[PDB]
């Protein structure tokens, strides 16, 4: 094909105080090689705000411990089965925003992008 298919919910609605799993799966002809696979997760308050990386895969999962998320971010995927989902525990109203997943799976030439708008409902 001409692109890496990435499957995410365009809008994700979560009750304040609950856990938010951000689902992100992708398609590729090639087995994921942990020594070359790349994964980037970023947050932005809005489309015109800067992206803040909070998780990366380089050889292993790297949790950047972004301050706005405390220690509530967990990797919730499995690259060997094409799942790069993240978990956000105990969501607060400030977690509302745009979450981007960027994927590269060498030697696959196409790179992937998923974009989720997380909205926090009143509890």
Numbering used by the authors: 27 to 149
Q: What does the primary publication say about this deposited structure?
A:
In addition to 55Cys, the hβ2 crystal structure reveals a unique motif bearing a protruding disulfide-stabilized loop formed by 72Cys and 75Cys. To determine if this loop regulates the gating or pharmacological influence of hβ2 on hNav1.2, we mutated 72Cys and 75Cys to Ala (C72A C75A) but found that it is functionally indistinguishable from WT hβ2. The lack of effect of the C72A C75A mutant on hNav1.2 function suggests that this disulfide bond is not essential for folding, and that its disruption may not significantly affect the position or environment of 55Cys. To verify this hypothesis, we produced recombinant hβ2 extracellular domain containing three Cys mutations: C55A, C72A, and C75A. Size exclusion chromatography demonstrates that the mutant produces monomeric protein, indicating that the bond between 72Cys and 75Cys is unessential for folding. Furthermore, we obtained a crystal structure of the triple mutant at 1.85Å which overlays well onto the C55A structure. The only significant difference is situated in the loop containing both cysteines, which now displays a single conformation. Although the spatial organization of this loop does not seem to impact the ability of hβ2 to modulate hNav1.2 gating or sensitivity to ProTx-II, this region may yet play a functional role in modulating other Nav channel isoforms.
Voltage-gated sodium (Nav) channels are part of membrane-embedded signaling complexes that initiate the rising phase of action potentials, a crucial event in generating and propagating electrical signals throughout the human body. As key components of these protein assemblies, β-subunits (1) modify Nav channel-gating properties; (2) regulate channel trafficking and localization to distinct surface compartments; and (3) influence channel oligomerization. Structurally, β-subunits are single-transmembrane segment glycoproteins with a short cytoplasmic C-terminal tail and a large V-type immunoglobulin (Ig) extracellular domain that may participate in homophilic and heterophilic interactions, cell adhesion, and cell migration. Of the four known β-subunits and their splice variants (β1–4; gene names Scn1b-Scn4b), β2 and β4 form a disulfide bond with an unidentified Cys within particular Nav channel isoforms.
